[model samples]
Target chain A: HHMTVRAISPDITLFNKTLTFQEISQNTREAVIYIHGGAWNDPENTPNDFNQLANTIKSMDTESTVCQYSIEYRLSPEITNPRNLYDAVSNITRLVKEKGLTNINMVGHSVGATFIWQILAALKDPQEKMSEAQLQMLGLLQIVKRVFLLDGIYSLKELLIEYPEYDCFTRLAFPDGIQMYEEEPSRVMPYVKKALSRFSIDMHLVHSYSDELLTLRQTNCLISCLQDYQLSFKLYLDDLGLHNDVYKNGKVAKYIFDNIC
Target chain B: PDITLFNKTLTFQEISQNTREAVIYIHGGAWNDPENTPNDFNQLANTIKSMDTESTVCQYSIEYRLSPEITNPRNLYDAVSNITRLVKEKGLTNINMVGHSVGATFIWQILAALKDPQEKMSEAQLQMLGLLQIVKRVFLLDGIYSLKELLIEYPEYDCFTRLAFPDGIQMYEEEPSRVMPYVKKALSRFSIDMHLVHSYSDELLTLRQTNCLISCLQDYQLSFKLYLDDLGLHNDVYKNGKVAKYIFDNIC
Candidate 1:
């Protein structure tokens, strides 16, 4: 039987917002947390969006050994950069400190995957000083053993070059436009490399051929970044249905379940 | 602005607001085929609008996430939620719903779910009840009603059927026949009209599917019309404008 735990209340923050996460308890020590992506602004893309994949994982787990959590954060237009990253770190921090989850797996799709890297980059940035809460979040992230990045947008510059029409959502996500892309290589990649050097996260990069919204170039971009730093990671490229269909069809869940410890 | 409810987008267009009559479309792809989407109804919707010189008809096309990833009741729930949003949030009434193939199955499922007392009344069910109150007409175009009947008639299609219902034929057999009784109950309470359409030359699904539904409705005292024609293949009926014209000309 699958059991759903009530969502923990939001932590008091600058936003004073109700950031919620759905926890499906399987009475397991280890947990897998998911962050969904909808151009970082779609109100429809909530934690509930992970229900299909979560259900598939539960169905596959005969032993009920893996617990599941899907996190929801504030979106763009209403809020911008650092807010989403802040929400992600804060929620995961809560999961580790309050829920007492030690062993953890992380999965993020589309921009959600981008947030994973953003959180890491922010933690490892040498130029920026960290607050007490940032240090706590960084410590909690250490429990994350494996990170699955699915069809993420790593290089905004390359994305616009390939699909200029995507500027519609990209602009809303980062209203400052080209400046965000300029800061990525200088501020983002170097810090991401630094974070990966210190934290031994087994990164799994995935993309689908049938994904019309995003091409394999996005995955290649991340691979390129990792290769530049000599960072070790795994790559999975397959015909897993359409962009969203990857998660919808149970293939992504199956892939995660197969490799997840 | 397009209303997004239950993570699915419902495209609504107000033509003139001179009349309460509104047409809602649900597309079909055997429940898993991503190629079949709400956008597929644009041609039919446009044709209906063009044919309507009065400029009184509004239109809506609902998008529900497909199967092989999500299955069965979830699609039904998505459909009900979209309709409820239209009725309650958008304040849409006198809805003329047109559902094709598995989309048609959703309409039947929604009607059945509205009055099914065996399941406890949840928020979704209550919303569905509210939807039943506002819906004026339903057009089921080449829908699947009986899963057991479908598999037996076309065993070759079992692979597709299982994609939507993992339990396969057993799921349909075990569950009480929710369509007939619930549809009967809705007909008794509301003045909702029903139209069933199928083409004899359709190659994807046989006429037996429509015949099976007709047989079930025979027991009910409710009134419903069945339209049969030689409108090419399964999707050809709508693709060729026969279904659109039928709906446009027959709207009450």
Candidate 2:
């Protein structure tokens, strides 16, 4: 397997950051895309956070050709919902349109899950009057075959009620208010339903019973909403580790390889 | 109005000429609250009877043995036996069941138990399966779905939970997995509609309970509708006749 890394955006300043794309082979069409979570702000959290898991995945798949991509976006306190969401969408769009990667397996952690869901919701009903970026994002989504939402926060209202102290970071990430945070999942349902009607897109919801930062309630609430909408999904519950350790320990990597990949 | 079956008394009102559509009510009182009896559904039952002037519905309020005196599946067995007797003896064809609080827990437990291969088939389980064939809809109102989740959120309720199970928390902790296969089997075989109701103002139980069950149902790809509102307290939905109105509007 051959490995390489490069910046996706030409202007590598502020929100315009690097995307690590490592090509394993030219023979395979499948790619695993990773999005990290830091409550949408912490500078320490970057695409590098996925290196351990990426390495583990590569080691596990010695024979199969699988490329890996990890995205980096703008931080908060200076940026908000649509800004971060737009950055993620553009990064993914670039991967599909520029890199010609067709088959995608998305893995989002914490707030990363929020970004992926928001993008899906925004592209629910694509219009001819939409921007080029938006159209490209929509085009990339059709190739998304599997999504792994790891210990993600689905509802900000529920988050505030459960952990009021979390308001510090949530306020920074979503300075506007909690209204959109509550409405994001509802918005995603239309796209989820539409996508499911055409083909089976595997939605894997992963949550740790021992996760301290975010309770199992977050995943539980998402499951409830999906059930109400009569949507189909698979749930993976275990004591992988605390909030961040799940991905860091390569357990998530192994799970993805053995179960999803 | 009072009929005895399985050595327990239940209230039934036949106000409808249409025997195909009947409503069954099970009261919730944490399985040990003596005050929470079949009569708790009085107002709701009266409201339904009054609203159905054309005689399209019948009603039954079931009763079972309380906890502390009896533990574990005894209470569940009693309810199952009585419901089976009512459905069989009366020859009721289509039934809509409503359960509140612990009663809601009982509904899920019965569904989970009916097909559990681990548990030997008893007469009641077989009879209950027959009764389930006629069950058209199940409305679980403000119920506790996961005992582990309940203990995590509100540990203070451990006293009542123990009074019902009395086998320690570990037994109930492994319950969801143990019962899941059976519950899925039952739901797959039967086309029963599920209605999950919860109130934001509910002071006793949180929404996590409903969410937990909904999560499992989603995994099974089973269809269910959720009714959430600012409706009064946990028991007030039945006490104030709101539950009856919901049942009347939704009963097919």
Candidate 3:
């Protein structure tokens, strides 16, 4: 019943950037950092998906917030390997410390889910980064109890060949780094799949009924073939969700919220 | 055989009586003193009649004549004449008699008077029993002999004290003349021809009366089975021991 809200921007001095945050309340029981989905060129720059995810987690309990950032690198015309990911890592590292948040849970849909997987791997095996500022980002992972994906591209290798029209993120996000045969199929390919598989964080896969961008079966086969992966993931196909609101109610959001702490 | 008819004289009423053949026992009792005629005192007529269903049961007691001059034997002659007249009137034959007490003494006299052992018994007497021509058996229980000898010991014990034995007085009067004649005729008449029972305890007649009689009849060889006991006494056959049923089952 008791709640208060404060907004804060995290300072990542080496990148010289501020990570966006909408802290729903201070003295929060738990924090949820959500990642938003769009092709690299986000046509509408829609904040509704993040809003729905945050509101659904808030419905579970009021102690929830979203990582509302502009993936400036994804919005660029030329996508590079690890460019959006580096931003994902840099932003969450700054935002969590700035809010003094603990017991944080992450929810991502599509490419946002892909970035969250990258953020988790970065914290699981922390490197002595060249920046003292970047080192504090690792602390966010300790209280981060869960990771959830709602219809994200778990296997980057499959998506490029399968949906060439939806290759804006793949082309700009990892333009230089994809293998030749896997170029189109391996387009936005290698970065997150390799990251999530190498670490043992299970994903909850929410399948959409009609996504012109990708088929439900394609992601399912990718999640199945994952190797050395102790993953906890499930497929939810509810009417309240398709490609858009498919991640709306946050079955994965609440799953992470409840299990993470 | 030494044939004899010890008690074969009696008046009978009918032709059917002639074939009855079984002895018509006219058991005696002194009219004034009843105890001397014991077998009848026990009312054994029914017992014997039940056993020998065809046999005549005669419990004949008559008033002996009270004339002191007459004797018991001569009075018995009146009974004998009554039987002989009945015999002539009926014109039947083949019946016999059983004279049981002093009546036995009278039967001997009657037989002697007839002079023929075969005709001495009234024939019409047995015709009443459906045996027109058979006369074979006689049982004399405690037969009496020598009334003089009997009254000599107990003079007041005479059967003539009752009026039934009127001939006892007459016979008493003529005993010196007639006694030996009747005894001689009886001893030969009863010899082996009729069944005899003389018991050891019988006071009226000793064993000699039966034994001496059976010995005389052996000269004539008549077949018989005589039972002599220590005690079928004083007209004992009337009610003395177990009655023999064969006599009734088969007509004698």
Best by DockQ: 2
Taking the tens digit of each residue's C-alpha lDDT, what string does model 2 give over B114-160?
55353676776676676667888888889877888889999999889
- For candidate 3, give the lDDT: 0.45
Interface RMSD (Å) of model 1? 27.2
**Candidate 1 or 2, higher DockQ?**
2
For model 1, how does the per-residue alpha-carbon lDDT over A1-261 read when each residue is reduced to its tens digit?
642333444443322222223353555655788888888788877776777888888788767777787776778777776667677777667666556788788888888888776766655534357776567557755777788888887778888999999888878778887566433643467766666657766677777767889876776566556545545465555567777776665767876877674
TM-score of model 1 (CA atoms): 0.47
Candidate 1 structure quality by residue, lDDT tens digits, B68-113: 8778777767777777776666667668889989888887776775
lDDT of 3 by residue, B97-187 (tens): 4555555555444433323234454442222112222334444444544455555555776545334445454434323134335433543
A109-175: candidate 2 lDDT, tens digit per residue: 8888776666555446558666765665566567888788888877888889999999899888888
Give the TM-score of chain A in candidate 3.
Answer: 0.67
Native-referenced DockQ of model 2: 0.02
Ranking by TM-score: 2, 1, 3
Candidate 3 has a DockQ of: 0.00
Cα error, residue B11 of model 1, in Å, equals 64
After the best TM-score superposition of candidate 1, give how far the Cα of residue A18 lies from its true spot, in angstroms: 9.3
Q: What CA RMSD would candidate 1 show?
A: 23.0
User: Total clashing residue pairs per candidate?
Assistant: 1, 0, 42
> What tier of docking accuracy does candidate 2 attain?
incorrect
